[PDB]
């Protein structure tokens, strides 16, 4: 029941020979040159890779073996991970991994999973009830490795994490875990105390790397396994040792604290820029999906550029204590540093489309919806343009005026419905309707 994650097989991987597997951590570090992380949710993939990056940072700090590009594995890290077996420990009292003191605030263990509805969340897409379904230990570690990056506010008396609202997260990609680590390798100055050590008494103005990148904003104590025969309602693997409940406690974040995640995107005021997607298409927003165009200005302006590479671009969008959506998109880039006017215009594409839809042919003021039939064809044209996001951002083969032709074929079919007469005047209005191209403005 101790369930040490260093020896137990918990991380789901895929081998490049087409063989999926569920392996441990030591095996992952040994075969990072011949495996990839296999997770359906992009959020889980990103946070797992962040945990491996944190472990690599600690291993480099305490072993002084800098990882090298195009290498299988920096040696002697596995014995050092073996010397610290007693820390990364699950249930069984003593030292516990990412697990603080137990309290009286008891919630269902599905509280820490965003997708599964609980605690007055409507259940329409996942039919579950609290304290009835359970999670396997691998999914327990997956949920535990989620607080510092993907937590949100609660009700009255409950705040958010060290990142306030969860912002955009941006980082590099490769063909395997070793190359991913080497491409995303960047040691800092102040390592700090990682949260798996236990000493969380920081009380300092400056927050270290491992202190903040593992900064859990809650105090949790998951309970003991319960015998039974069911399936975990996050992965479906048939298991008999399912845990069913936990205990939670909120640790408030002190103000006047400086900590910058070296994978995020901030606004001009450092306000944790967030993916602006919704499902209503209100007065100030028009639904177009795939919010990749927003954070490619702030990330591509301050030390986030490595010329060549692949941008991973995890996007999680929520509004207050309500998760909305999660998505991902890789973008291939080679370099070719450009100006800022086209970059700023492309970064503000959300309000350029909303001006296209909200343009009617009559004399009412802004209290109007415009032409709603354009909003139906906007997502398809946006998705078709989105195949060349790298060329759009680098502006080497793509442009705003280059992308305006994609609406030209779609707008021809809409005009036949809005002006269905066969007169000369109706043909003239159909001709003027195809000219409706989005205008970049900031």
């Amino acid at each position: 029941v101790m369930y040490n994650l260093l020896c137990d097989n918990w991380v789901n991987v895929v081998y490049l020979s087409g063989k999926p597997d569920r392996i441990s951590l030591v095996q992952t570090l040994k075969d990072a040159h011949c495996l990839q992380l296999a997770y359906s949710n992009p959020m889980d993939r990103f946070t797992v890779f962040r945990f491996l990056l944190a472990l690599g940072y600690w291993c480099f700090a305490n072993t002084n073996v800098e990882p090298e590009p195009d290498k299988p594995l920096p040696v002697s890290w596995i014995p050092w991970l073996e010397e610290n077996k007693e820390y990364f420990e699950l249930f069984g009292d003593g030292k516990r991994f990412f697990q603080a003191d137990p309290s009286s605030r008891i919630r269902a263990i599905t509280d820490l999973i965003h997708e599964i509805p609980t605690a007055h969340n409507l259940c329409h897409f996942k039919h579950v009830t609290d304290y009835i379904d359970g999670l396997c230990e691998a999914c327990c570690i997956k949920g535990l490795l989620r607080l510092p990056v993907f937590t949100t506010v609660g009700g009255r008396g409950i705040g958010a994490g060290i990142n306030n609202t969860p912002p955009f997260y941006l980082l590099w990609h490769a063909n395997d875990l070793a190359g991913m680590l080497a491409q995303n390798w960047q040691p800092w100055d102040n390592m700090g105390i990682p949260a798996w050590l236990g000493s969380f008494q920081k009380e300092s103005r400056e927050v270290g790397l491992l202190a903040g990148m593992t900064w859990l904003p809650r105090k949790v104590y998951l309970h003991d396994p319960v015998p039974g025969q069911a399936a975990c309602c996050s992965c479906g693997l048939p298991s008999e040792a399912l845990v069913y409940s936990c205990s939670i406690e909120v640790e408030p974040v002190p103000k006047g604290l400086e900590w910058k995640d070296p994978h995020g995107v901030y606004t001009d005021q450092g306000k944790s820029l967030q993916s602006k997607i919704k499902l209503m298409s209100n007065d100030r927003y028009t639904f177009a999906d795939r919010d990749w165009y927003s954070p490619l200005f702030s990330y591509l302006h301050a030390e986030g550029n490595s010329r060549q590479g692949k941008l991973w671009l995890v996007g999680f969008a929520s509004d207050k204590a309500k998760s909305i959506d999660i998505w991902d998109k890789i973008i291939e880039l080679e370099g070719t540093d450009t100006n800022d006017e086209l970059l700023a215009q492309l970064a503000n594409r959300a309000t350029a489309l909303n001006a296209m839809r909200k343009k009617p042919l009559r004399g009412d003021f802004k209290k109007s919806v415009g032409t709603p039939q354009i909003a139906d064809i906007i997502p398809h044209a946006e998705n078709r343009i989105a195949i060349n996001a790298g060329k759009m951002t680098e502006n080497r083969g793509y442009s705003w005026q280059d992308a305006d032709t994609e609406y030209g074929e779609l707008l021809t079919k809409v005009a036949y419905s809005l002006e269905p007469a066969q007169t000369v005047d109706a043909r003239l209005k159909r001709g003027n309707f195809i000219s409706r191209k989005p205008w970049p403005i900031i």
Partner: protein, 266 residues
């Protein structure tokens, strides 16, 4: 075996289904833009009807949904012609005179008239296993759904437009593999002075049925179908080697014929 109902229904200018902006819901087919009614709207309007509920393990839980899987299957109501949305400019009035002839409110609403094609499917095996071998109640609820779907409409904006139309053509067929006839209206229906909107849609449906009967549906198994129009208003394929096995001029006769085929119950 499977039962399939194909339906042709013209509607007066109205807005029977909206979206987040008020426009009628649309879709894309045949290279053009067609009006649409979402399937869940039709299913809800059929299910919550008071006359339907006052008519007939529960029969609605057996037919519709709540693993209880429904034998019912409602497809999106595509239109057999290019959509024609329109804007109506409304002005609110004030009964109290003022310094000027102001309105109080000014705005625009949307409406559209369309000849929709509806597709339905009932799985007989799932229906009879849902009620534990019962057959007479299965035929009773099939007939109840037939009358309800023939005499119902969505309630969207019906206090202002009142599109209480009735269907002008029903085709009930029995076969195994599920195929819908939306491919008939790949070419949008264009009106001529010598026909109606409903007449041309029914004729194109007849042409597609004739072409597919000359093709895939060989002599492996005969296909039994019944065609209904009120008082024999529209024929589906006049003569044409009896494309439709029967021509019906009353809803009760079609319901009785389908019931007598499926079980011989009355």
């Amino acid at each position: 075996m499977l039962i399939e109902i194909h339906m042709i229904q013209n509607h007066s200018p109205a807005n029977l289904n909206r979206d987040d902006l008020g426009a009628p819901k649309t879709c894309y087919f045949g290279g053009v833009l067609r009006s649409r009614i979402s399937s869940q709207c039709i299913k809800r309007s059929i299910r919550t009807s008071n006359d339907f509920k006052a008519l007939l393990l529960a029969p609605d839980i057996a037919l519709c949904g709540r693993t209880v899987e429904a034998a019912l299957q409602v497809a999106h109501a595509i239109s057999t012609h290019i959509a024609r949305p329109e804007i109506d400019y409304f002005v609110a009035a004030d009964d109290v005179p003022g310094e000027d002839a102001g309105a109080g409110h000014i705005g625009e609403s949307m409406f559209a008239s369309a000849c929709f094609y509806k597709y339905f499917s009932i799985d007989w095996e799932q229906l009879v296993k849902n009620l534990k071998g019962d057959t007479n109640l299965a035929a009773h609820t099939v007939g109840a759904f037939l009358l309800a779907a023939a005499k119902t409409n969505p309630s969207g904006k019906q206090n202002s437009f009142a599109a209480h139309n009735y269907p002008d053509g029903i085709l009930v067929e029995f076969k195994n593999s599920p195929i819908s006839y939306a491919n008939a209206f790949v070419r949008p229906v264009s009106v001529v002075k010598e026909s109606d909107l409903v007449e041309q849609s029914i004729g194109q449906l007849s042409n597609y049925v004739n072409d597919i009967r000359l093709g895939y549906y060989d002599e492996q198994s005969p296909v039994i179908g019944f065609w209904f129009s009120p008082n024999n208003r529209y024929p589906l394929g006049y003569k044409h080697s009896k494309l439709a096995s029967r021509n019906i001029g009353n809803l009760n006769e079609l319901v009785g014929a389908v019931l007598d085929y499926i079980g011989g119950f009355k």
